[PDB]
C-alpha cells in the first residue's frame, strides 16, 4: 500500500512538473495585443410564460427555433422562439425532474431527475400523443445531466459518481464510466461526439471517450463543486463553473487552465455556462438574479443580462448564435438577442 | 397577418396554457411534506400506518385525511450529497423528522446515533432554504425507551445529565435538547409529538400542524404577516 501511494504521489508530481513546463506563456499576455470588445447590449425579445414551477434545464434544437425546457411541475414544454407557442406538453410521471435533452433530429427527448431513471419520449409517434418510449433504469442516484450522442445511443449522468452509456434499441448500458470521487453534475458533448468532458463535486473534470470508455485526461484547479461544464465550439477546450464564483477554461492539449474569470463583487456560485457560435464571448449564469458575459480572450465583462427574479438555473445559445435563452427558478424563460 | 396554420397553432398554445393552469390549480390543493430520519427511526412503520389508514430513488406517498391531500416525499434511500438537491424542496410545506428515542446506548459503524441525529436535525433546521419551513419531530420508539431506561441509565449518552432516572424527566430533557437546536425560533416552529402504538393521534397531529402552517402561509401571502 505504501509503495502504491508513493508511486501515485510521484506520478502526480511528474504530471504537475510537466503541466508547469508546458506553460510557456499565459493567454492574457497574448490576447492583450488585440483591442477589447465593445459594450454588448442585449434586450429581451420574447418573454415565455406558462410555467408554474422552478426551471432547472433547457436545451435548443438543431433548427435553432425549438427549445425544450423542464420544470419541477412535471411538465416538459417545447417552446418556439419565433412565435412563443407551445408545440408539445409532455406530462412527467415524476415531477422531480432536473435535466432534459433534445435529440439532434428532434424525434426523441430525454429527461431525468430524483427518480434515478431516464425517460425517453418520442415526438413523432403515429398515435399522435407523446408517450414514453424507453425507461433507462440502473442508476443509484439522481440524474444530473444527459445528452444525445446519437439517435441510437445516449449518455446520462447520475449522482452515483459513475456515468453510463445506454443504447435505446437495447436499453442496457454498454459502457460504464467510473473514476469520479464526487457526484457528476453536468456534461458537455464535443462537436464530433467522440469525446466528452464531465465535472463532479470533487472539484475536477474528466475527459471520456465513447468507444474506449476510459478517462482520457483529468483537469483540476477548482475549489468547489463544479456545477456547469460546456465544450468549446472548436472542440479543443472547455469551460467549467463551480460554486467558487469563478469560471475556468481548460484545454485538452495543454492539460492546464488558460485564464480565470472572476470579479470582486461576485461571491455567489455559478449555475450554467455556454459558449457562443464563434466562442469570442462566454456567458455565465450566477445566483444574483442575472447572468454575466465575459471575454473569452481578455476575461473583461462584456455585459449583464438582468430581469430574472430568482436564481438563474440554465442558459443556452442557439446553434446559429442568433439569440440565447435563459431560464431561472422564477418560472420564466427569456430570450436575449 | 397570421395565416390559418398560425392561428390554429396560437389556439392550440392557448388551450395548452389553459390545461397547464388547470393542472397547477389542481396540484396546489395538495400539501407537500418531506420525510427525514434514520432508517431505523421507524419511518417505515409511520408510512405503513398512514397508508393503511387511507426501486432506488425517492418514494412518494399520497393520502387524504379530513378533505385534505398530502404528498409525503421520502428521500432516505438517496444516499448522496444532500446540499446539492435539497434546495428543490424549498417550497415544501413541512418536514417530518423521525428519530430513534430508544437508540441512545447503541453504537453505529459521530459514533453514537443520537449525536448524528441531532446534527442532521440542526443542519436541516438552520438550512438557508428551510428558513420559513416548519419541522415536526416524531419519537417512534418511546416504548423501547421506557423498557430500556429501567435497566440502562441515560447517563451513558448524556454524561452532564443529572436529573432523576424516571421516564418523564428524561423525555422532558430530550425534548428540551432537541428544541434548543433551533436557531430561528422567531421565523419557524417545531411541533413535537410522541408516537405510540396508536396511529390516529399522529395523523390528527400532522393534520393540525399542516393546518397551522397553511394558516401562517396564507397570512404571510395576503400581506398581514
Amino acid at each position, epitope marked *: 500500500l505504501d509503495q502504491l501511494r508513493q508511486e501515485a504521489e510521484q506520478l502526480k508530481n511528474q504530471i504537475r512538473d510537466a503541466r508547469k513546463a508546458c506553460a510557456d506563456a499565459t493567454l492574457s499576455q497574448i490576447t492583450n495585443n488585440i483591442d477589447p470588445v465593445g459594450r454588448i447590449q442585449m434586450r429581451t425579445r420574447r418573454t415565455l410564460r406558462g410555467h408554474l414551477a422552478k426551471i432547472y434545464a433547457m436545451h435548443w434544437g438543431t433548427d435553432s427555433r425549438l427549445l425544450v425546457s423542464a420544470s419541477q411541475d412535471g411538465k416538459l414544454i417545447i417552446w418556439d422562439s419565433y412565435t412563443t407557442n407551445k*408545440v408539445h406538453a409532455i406530462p412527467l410521471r415524476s415531477s422531480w425532474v432536473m435535466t432534459c435533452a433534445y435529440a439532434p433530429s428532434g424525434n426523441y427527448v430525454a429527461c431525468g431527475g430524483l427518480d434515478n431513471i431516464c425517460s425517453i419520449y418520442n415526438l413523432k409517434t403515429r*398515435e*399522435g400523443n407523446v408517450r414514453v418510449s424507453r425507461e433507462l433504469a440502473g442508476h443509484t442516484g439522481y440524474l444530473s445531466c444527459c445528452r444525445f450522442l446519437d439517435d441510437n445511443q445516449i449518455v446520462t449522468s447520475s449522482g452515483d459518481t459513475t456515468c453510463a452509456l445506454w443504447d435505446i434499441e437495447t436499453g442496457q448500458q454498454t459502457t460504464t464510466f467510473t473514476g469520479h470521487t464526487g457526484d457528476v453534475m453536468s456534461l458537455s458533448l464535443a462537436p464530433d461526439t467522440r469525446l466528452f468532458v464531465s465535472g463532479a463535486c470533487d472539484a475536477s473534470a474528466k475527459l471520456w471517450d465513447v468507444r474506449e470508455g476510459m478517462c482520457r485526461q483529468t483537469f483540476t484547479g477548482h475549489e468547489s463543486d463544479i456545477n456547469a461544464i460546456c465544450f468549446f465550439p472548436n472542440g479543443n477546450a472547455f469551460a467549467t463553473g463551480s460554486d467558487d464564483a469563478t469560471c475556468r477554461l481548460f484545454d485538452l492539449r495543454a492539460d492546464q487552465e488558460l485564464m480565470t474569470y472572476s470579479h470582486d463583487n461576485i461571491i455567489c456560485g455559478i449555475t450554467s455556462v455556454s459558449f457562443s457560435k464563434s466562442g469570442r464571448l462566454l456567458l455565465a449564469g450566477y445566483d444574483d438574479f442575472n447572468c454575466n458575459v465575459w471575454d473569452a480572450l481578455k476575461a473583461d465583462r462584456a455585459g449583464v443580462l438582468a430581469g430574472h427574479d430568482n436564481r438563474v438555473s440554465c442558459l443556452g445559445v442557439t446553434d446559429d448564435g442568433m439569440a440565447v435563452a435563459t431560464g431561472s427558478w422564477d418560472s420564466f424563460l427569456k430570450i436575449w438577442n | 397577418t397570421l*395565416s390559418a*396554420e398560425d392561428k*390554429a397553432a396560437v*389556439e392550440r398554445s392557448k388551450m395548452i396554457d389553459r390545461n397547464l393552469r388547470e393542472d397547477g390549480e389542481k396540484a396546489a390543493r395538495e400539501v407537500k411534506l418531506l420525510l427525514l430520519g434514520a432508517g431505523e427511526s421507524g419511518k417505515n412503520t409511520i408510512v405503513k400506518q398512514m397508508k393503511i389508514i387511507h426501486t432506488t430513488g425517492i418514494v412518494e406517498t399520497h393520502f387524504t385525511f379530513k378533505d385534505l391531500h398530502f404528498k409525503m416525499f421520502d428521500v432516505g434511500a438517496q444516499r448522496s450529497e444532500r446540499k446539492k438537491w435539497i434546495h428543490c424542496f424549498e417550497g415544501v410545506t413541512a418536514i417530518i423528522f423521525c428519530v430513534a428515542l430508544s437508540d441512545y446506548d447503541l453504537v453505529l459503524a459521530e459514533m453514537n446515533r443520537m449525536h448524528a441525529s441531532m446534527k442532521l436535525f440542526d443542519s436541516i433546521c438552520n438550512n438557508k432554504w428551510f428558513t420559513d419551513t416548519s419541522i415536526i419531530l416524531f419519537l417512534n420508539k418511546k416504548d423501547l425507551f421506557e423498557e430500556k431506561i429501567k435497566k440502562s441509565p441515560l447517563t451513558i449518552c448524556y454524561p452532564e445529565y443529572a436529573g432523576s432516572n424516571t421516564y418523564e424527566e428524561a423525555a422532558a430533557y430530550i425534548q428540551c435538547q432537541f428544541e434548543d437546536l433551533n436557531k430561528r425560533k422567531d421565523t419557524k416552529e417545531i411541533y413535537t409529538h410522541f408516537t405510540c402504538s396508536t396511529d390516529t393521534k399522529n395523523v390528527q397531529f400532522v393534520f393540525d400542524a399542516v393546518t397551522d402552517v397553511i394558516i401562517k402561509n396564507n397570512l404571510k401571502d395576503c400581506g398581514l404577516f
Partner: single-chain antibody, 230 residues
Framework: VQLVESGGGLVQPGGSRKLSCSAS????????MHWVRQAPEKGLEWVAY????????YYADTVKGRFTISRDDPKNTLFLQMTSLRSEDTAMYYC??????????????WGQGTTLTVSDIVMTQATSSVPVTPGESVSISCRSS???????????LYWFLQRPGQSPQLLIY???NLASGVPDRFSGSGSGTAFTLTISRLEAEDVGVYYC?????????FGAGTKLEL
C-alpha cells in the same frame, strides 16, 4: 389509426342525414377533422372543419349555414348533420385528420369515406392525363391564382395521391417536407404561384390521381387532379 364512416344511401332532397365517423387509435381531441367530398368524376372539395376543443368552426360558402358539423371528443366520434340535400350534393365524404404545430403533417390520414346518394384562390393543373410507362420520370405542374408564399417564409401547399379504390394519401406538405412513410421518389418544388411535383421513377403503386391543395386561407380549393396510368 382507423376511421369508419356511417350514414348515407338514397336520401330524398327534403330529407336529412347524420353522418357519423368513429375515431379511435389516436388523440382525437388534439387532432381536428376535415370533411372533403368527391363527386363522381370530379375533384375534391373542402366542406367544413372544427378546431381543437370546438373553439373554432368554419364552413365553406357552398355549405355555410346549411350543414352543421359537430364534434364529440369524450365519445371520440365526429358528427355531420345535413339538413337539406340538393341535386348536386351527391359525393363521397371523407374524413381527414389535421393537427397544427411547427413541423406538423396535417391531412396525412384519409378515412375510407361513405357514399351518399341524393335522389377564393383558384388552383389549376396544366395537364390532366399524361400516359407514361413505368421507369420514366414524371412531372405534374400546378398554378395558383394567388401567391401562396407567406411573409413567414413558407409556402402552404399540399399534394394528395388517390389510387383506385383507395383514399387520398399525403405525399408532400409545405412544398418542402416529404410525408412520413412515402417513398423518396416524390419531390415538390415551386416559386410563388407555379409549382411542380416530380417523380424520379414511376411504379405500379403510383397509378392514381394527384390533387393539389392550398392552405393559405380558410376557403380551401382543389384542382382538377392529374391522373396517371401505365
Amino acid at each position: 389509426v382507423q376511421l369508419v364512416e356511417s350514414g348515407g344511401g338514397l336520401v330524398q332532397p327534403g330529407g336529412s342525414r347524420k353522418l357519423s365517423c368513429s375515431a379511435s387509435g389516436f388523440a382525437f381531441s388534439s387532432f381536428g377533422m376535415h370533411w372533403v367530398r368527391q363527386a363522381p368524376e370530379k375533384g375534391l372539395e373542402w366542406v367544413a372543419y372544427i378546431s381543437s376543443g370546438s373553439g373554432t368552426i368554419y364552413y365553406a360558402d357552398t355549405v355555410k349555414g346549411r350543414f352543421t358539423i359537430s364534434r364529440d371528443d369524450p365519445k371520440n366520434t365526429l358528427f355531420l348533420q345535413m339538413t337539406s340535400l340538393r341535386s348536386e350534393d351527391t359525393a363521397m365524404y371523407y374524413c381527414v385528420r389535421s393537427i397544427y404545430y411547427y413541423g406538423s403533417s396535417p391531412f396525412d390520414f384519409w378515412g375510407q369515406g361513405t357514399t351518399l346518394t341524393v335522389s377564393d384562390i383558384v388552383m389549376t393543373q396544366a395537364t390532366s392525363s399524361v400516359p407514361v410507362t413505368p421507369g420514366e420520370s414524371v412531372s405534374i405542374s400546378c398554378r395558383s391564382s394567388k401567391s401562396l408564399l407567406h411573409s413567414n417564409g413558407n409556402t402552404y401547399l399540399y399534394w394528395f395521391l388517390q389510387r383506385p379504390g383507395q383514399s387520398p394519401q399525403l405525399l408532400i406538405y409545405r412544398m418542402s417536407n416529404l410525408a412520413s412513410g412515402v417513398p423518396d421518389r416524390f419531390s415538390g418544388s415551386g416559386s410563388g404561384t407555379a409549382f411542380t411535383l416530380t417523380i424520379s421513377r414511376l411504379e405500379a403503386e403510383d397509378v392514381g390521381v394527384y390533387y393539389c391543395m392550398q392552405h393559405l386561407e380558410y376557403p380551401l380549393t382543389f384542382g382538377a387532379g392529374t391522373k396517371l396510368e401505365l
